């Protein structure tokens, strides 16, 4: 289910991913995670959607805002992410994404 | 990658950019971005290409209809632009410009 990913990096360093809007696709997508990066080390996966940034729900914010939020968070940031399939399955079944909290399968 | 620039102006004010048709040049070119202008504030960069206006794909529209789409948007307009370097690289690599949307590197 959702995961809380605690990213941390050095000054001048990128976290090492793209945030994207994709044509006819819901959500703020994480793509092209660089090998060995802060993003990788924190558990980010290709196709994850960003639900929250430092606990603030952003699924309905504009891309520019979501980017700004990451950027203004400085050299650490907490992302609540959901994998692409769980995210599409949640939106399919009209689940309230706001009410989703961390869940792990073991 | 592409950016959405959200330009806003006062009534009777100009945005502060030109659109041109240039010989042996692909696409709807943003030129002459006035310093201090709405265009500059929104993040337009010289050599930017206009891909979409209020979401509508225009790279293959006539210059006259693109200008008119901007004017008809009144005192704000949303432009999906792709910087001149990324755009020239995309046309070479035969990328479908219709499929490009906002992207940021973090």
Summarize the helix and strand pattern of chain A as letters: EEEHEEHEH
CATH topology of chain A: Pdz3 Domain
H/I helix tally of chain A: 3
CATH architecture of chain A: Roll
**Could you state the CATH homologous superfamily of chain A?**
PDZ domain
CATH class of chain A: Mainly Beta
Distance between the termini of chain A: 11 Å
The shape of chain A, in one word, is globular
Strand content of chain A: 15-25%
Protein name (chains A, B): Na(+)/H(+) exchange regulatory cofactor NHE-RF3
Organism (chains A, B): Mus musculus
Family (chains A, B): Belongs to the NHER family.
Subcellular location (chains A, B): Membrane; Cell membrane
What does this molecule look like?
Chains A, B: This is Na(+)/H(+) exchange regulatory cofactor NHE-RF3. Chains A, B: It is found in: Membrane; Cell membrane. 2 copies of one chain form a homodimer. Chain A is an alpha+beta fold. Chain A has one domain (1-106): Roll (Pdz3 Domain), CATH 2.30.42. The first copy, chain A, is 22% helix and 25% strand. The first copy, chain A, contains 3 helices and 6 strands; from the N terminus they run βββαββαβα. In chain A, strands 1-6-4-5 form a 4-stranded antiparallel β-sheet. Chain A has a two-stranded antiparallel sheet with strand order 2-3. In chain A, strand 4 (49-53) and strand 5 form a beta hairpin. At the A-B interface, strand 2 and helix 2 of A face strand 1 and strand 7 of B.
């Amino acid at each position: 289910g959702p995961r809380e990913s605690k990213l941390s990096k050095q000054e001048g360093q990128n976290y090492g991913f793209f945030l994207r809007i994709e044509k006819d696709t819901d959500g703020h997508l994480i793509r092209v995670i660089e090998e060995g990066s802060p993003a990788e080390k924190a558990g980010l996966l290709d196709g994850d959607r960003v639900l929250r940034i430092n606990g603030v729900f952003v699924d309905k914010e504009e891309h520019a805002q979501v980017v700004e939020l990451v950027r203004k968070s400085g050299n650490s940031v907490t992302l609540l992410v959901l994998d692409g399939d769980s995210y599409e399955k949640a939106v399919k079944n009209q689940v309230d994404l706001k009410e989703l909290d961390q869940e792990a399968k073991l």
